[PDB]
Design a protein around this ligand. Sequence first.
Ligand SMILES: Cc1cc2nc3c(=O)[nH]c(=O)nc-3n(C[C@H](O)[C@H](O)[C@H](O)COP(=O)(O)OP(=O)(O)OC[C@H]3O[C@@H](n4cnc5c(N)ncnc54)[C@H](O)[C@@H]3O)c2cc1C
Ligand SMILES: Cc1cc2nc3c(=O)[nH]c(=O)nc-3n(C[C@H](O)[C@H](O)[C@H](O)COP(=O)(O)OP(=O)(O)OC[C@H]3O[C@@H](n4cnc5c(N)ncnc54)[C@H](O)[C@@H]3O)c2cc1C
Ligand SMILES: CN1CCN(C(=O)Nc2ccccc2)CC1
Ligand SMILES: CN1CCN(C(=O)Nc2ccccc2)CC1
Ligand SMILES: [Br-]
Ligand SMILES: [Br-]
Ligand SMILES: [Br-]
Ligand SMILES: [Br-]
Lengths: 489, 487
Amino acid sequence: HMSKAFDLVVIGAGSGGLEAGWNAATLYGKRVAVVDVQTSHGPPFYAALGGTCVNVGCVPKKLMVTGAQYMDHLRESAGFGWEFDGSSVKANWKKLIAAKNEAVLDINKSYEGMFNDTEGLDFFLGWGSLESKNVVVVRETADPKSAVKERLQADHILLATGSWPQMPAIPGIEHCISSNEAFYLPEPPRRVLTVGGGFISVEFAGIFNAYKPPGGKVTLCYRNNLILRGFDETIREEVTKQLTANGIEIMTNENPAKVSLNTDGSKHVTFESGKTLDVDVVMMAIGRIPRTNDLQLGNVGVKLTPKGGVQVDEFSRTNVPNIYAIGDITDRLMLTPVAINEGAALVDTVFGNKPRKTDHTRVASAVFSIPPIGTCGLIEEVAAKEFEKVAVYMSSFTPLMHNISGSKYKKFVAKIVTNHSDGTVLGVHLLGDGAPEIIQAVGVCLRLNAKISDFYNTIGVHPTSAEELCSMRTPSYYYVKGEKMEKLP
Amino acid sequence: SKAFDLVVIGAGSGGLEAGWNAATLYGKRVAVVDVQTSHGPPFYAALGGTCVNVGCVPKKLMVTGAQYMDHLRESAGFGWEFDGSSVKANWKKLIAAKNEAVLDINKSYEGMFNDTEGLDFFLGWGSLESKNVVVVRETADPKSAVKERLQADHILLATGSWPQMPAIPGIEHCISSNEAFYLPEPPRRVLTVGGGFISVEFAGIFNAYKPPGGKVTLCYRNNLILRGFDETIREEVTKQLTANGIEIMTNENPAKVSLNTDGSKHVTFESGKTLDVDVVMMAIGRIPRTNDLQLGNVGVKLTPKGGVQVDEFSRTNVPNIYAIGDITDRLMLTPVAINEGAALVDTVFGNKPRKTDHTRVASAVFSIPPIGTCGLIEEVAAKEFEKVAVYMSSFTPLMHNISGSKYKKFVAKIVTNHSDGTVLGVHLLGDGAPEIIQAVGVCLRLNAKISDFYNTIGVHPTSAEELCSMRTPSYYYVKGEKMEKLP
Ligand SMILES: Cc1cc2nc3c(=O)[nH]c(=O)nc-3n(C[C@H](O)[C@H](O)[C@H](O)COP(=O)(O)OP(=O)(O)OC[C@H]3O[C@@H](n4cnc5c(N)ncnc54)[C@H](O)[C@@H]3O)c2cc1C
Ligand SMILES: Cc1cc2nc3c(=O)[nH]c(=O)nc-3n(C[C@H](O)[C@H](O)[C@H](O)COP(=O)(O)OP(=O)(O)OC[C@H]3O[C@@H](n4cnc5c(N)ncnc54)[C@H](O)[C@@H]3O)c2cc1C
Ligand SMILES: CN1CCN(C(=O)Nc2ccccc2)CC1
Ligand SMILES: CN1CCN(C(=O)Nc2ccccc2)CC1
Ligand SMILES: [Br-]
Ligand SMILES: [Br-]
Ligand SMILES: [Br-]
Ligand SMILES: [Br-]
């Protein structure tokens, strides 16, 4: 049996790796091999062909949040005249999980067929690692002593293996799960603790809250004072209130110290403070770390950053000339469309004689909390460090429909942050139904260097939430040399 | 007799914007006239305007209510179980909640008048007595009792529009959207007449709240509903309305309506076909509301179509008399009337002329599912530009393969000047489309090109990211003719 040779070998058939591989083969006629550890979703390795987003990430979690939203819809419908037997309502988690599994598997199968049909784009099943500057080895397991399935000669090598959940080293950590296992729970937990203040903890808190059996309770804990670091602070505070209003208990300034099993098999959590909580599931969502351990990067000398991700320049190049890295493995912005963009730019540069680097600024993104967040660009306290004068335009109100629905706690927040010296829009931050859909074209605006006057001159679409972005002409307040104040001096 | 800088006839979308801005931003003395202080019969529109009282605001609440018919059925695919036989749609509860919200807005505008210096409200019917005198009378009759005589340096006509009713035998047994907002019971069988957004939106409202055995029919005299919107979307919304149980009768037009002994209506179409319904709602158009203004007293000129004629700065032919909003018979949208009112006041009472831009105005249809659009449709672009490219994406979103509403294709189209990539129009059909389109309207004011969309990083997973995923045209227009490939 002989080794096979390629222009490009991609380790990791995920969001970025598949974009790079497909573009290299179909746009530029190169011979490409792509390596992944599993052909469809789930245990044992969870991620698989298609990547983390497709298998245990954006795609299934969005379907599950959509399912969770129906708890709100069913209740809110009564204000509009809908009547039905409320005591008959049940949330069948097994049906949700089965429908999600079938959708993800359909995507898996379609990716499998792309490889069969596409000239110069081949898929190899196994664990990829670096043997030398121009040889990728594919083994049966992540153990470098496991059997060799293939050796792939490569002129160019792309590392795109993504990330993995981080688990804290506390006694009893073996009684806990991550988001990977959450996607496959046989039954919805009656009592669950989600640990972490980031988007995965918050999103799963919403999902469990809707599907919990009778008498259930969802608790989210976070070790610092206010969840969702990195997002607009008004929105951080409001999401906390609206989660609380829908029955989720938020424990800030708390952190698990150990976990043990009660005699009935439930989990007994003791926090560093000495508080205790009995739950049926502990889901850790305290961060994700780049997946570099299994690549054997020492064999070729690829440098990692202090944080632990592959060091890259603006063109995704490592310190080894023909070896590149994109996506979560670079430990920067961990978003699927950023990995895809980096992959396309890399391939245009290397094989297309059209150099291009990814712009990591002004990236629009969302949190599918209930209600959701959409954001693009800088938060005001960051802007205040860079610009002498910052203006903040802010509208916050319960929309009229939620005065009828009964969910009066659902305040919509729209904020625009500007460089007041010239009006340029530095960031836009939204909380409320539709926010992830509204924010997409906002990203186009910011890439075109829109000013606040460009928004205000635009005629609103009425009645919408989005029109609030086009009706703000006077700052709510300012930052002058870093200092917050209602008026300029 | 009382003296004012500005007298506004019509306390509506544009008239309230103009009056409030004149008083608070320019310190002027302002009087505003309307015929009713709160919503509903007998005059329907009132303080706040058509949008507030019998327009955008209440109809959006009722469309939201109607969407729950879809949400309840679609929840099942995501594991929600309940007793489907127990579901019923209480129209009376919907109407009462709508009435309370509108009334709250009416009261809010009252207090705005009580709280604002130099801004006064007068109840009654305004007309032009002379070039600088506005008379307020008890009724629309120009011989009813005078209540006020208002002299004005400047007069603003802002009386809006009114439903058009065809001259057919039995038209008196039909209603318009005005009465639809106040029906005591949801009609079991209803015919909505017209192909425009009001007919389409009410068809979806009635379809969700109809009692058992009910049926909604929409008829339209030409071949395809929603003229002026993107053709792909006109066809798809036809298909998706049909998929939800609405009967679309194209190339049909009522010729007469008669009374049945049980109180229902017998409609006879020009083709000879007949249909018995409980309610016939006419939504074939709205026309400028000019008859009660006595424009003959001063000589304000109308267009052949019946709008008050204006220049780009909303000026009539009579100096110091202006017109904005639906009475000018242009774009009949609330945000446009607001923009015109503010531009007018900035011009007259400030030192910077401003004119409203009527191009690239984003708008929506709250059909189920809804439409969002901004800018030119491809056949209008093809007449103005030598080379037009159309970028098209149309698919059923993954969630609706699970929900069971597989008919709900999302449609996204981008129309460009292919000579330089400039985006000329964007057209959307699907959940969230009115919200997605708003910032697209900002993009078109930054001369966005298709590559500006495609080079922007998407937000995933959303429907909106489709707008940033389209690189290659689906087809073209060259010198006005449609073709798949360039020549
Ligand atoms: C729960 C969750 C929700 C998320 N939601 C969103 C969202 O809504 N929006 C968003 O933009 N992002 C979201 N993300 C992030 C998104 O999933 C990642 O940013 C994106 O998938 C990273 O792409 P990538 O190409 O770096 O790697 P991935 O898509 O992770 O692909 C890496 C692949 O490498 C394979 N692999 C690993 N090691 C090896 C090896 N040695 N040999 C061969 N193959 C290997 C893995 O099996 C995997 O398939 C979410 C993530 C999670 C965990
Ligand atoms: C069913 C329906 C739905 C709509 N939905 C939308 C939508 O979703 N979005 C949108 O943008 N637009 C919508 N519109 C259009 C919108 O309502 C109008 O464009 C807007 O209200 C017109 O503003 P205006 O200032 O011209 O007049 P209006 O807001 O109509 O106000 C005119 C006022 O003048 C008063 N008046 C009339 N004659 C006299 C007189 N002689 N003396 C004193 N007062 C008088 C009337 O009582 C009324 O209050 C809708 C319209 C309808 C009918
Ligand atoms: C221009 N916008 C209009 C909407 N809006 C509100 O204040 N709305 C509102 C609705 C119901 C109760 C309270 C407030 C913000 C400004
Ligand atoms: C970039 N987009 C992604 C979405 N998309 C689809 O076709 N969606 C789809 C729907 C159901 C099953 C499979 C795919 C168009 C292209
Ligand atoms: Br279950
Ligand atoms: Br401005
Ligand atoms: Br018609
Ligand atoms: Br037609």
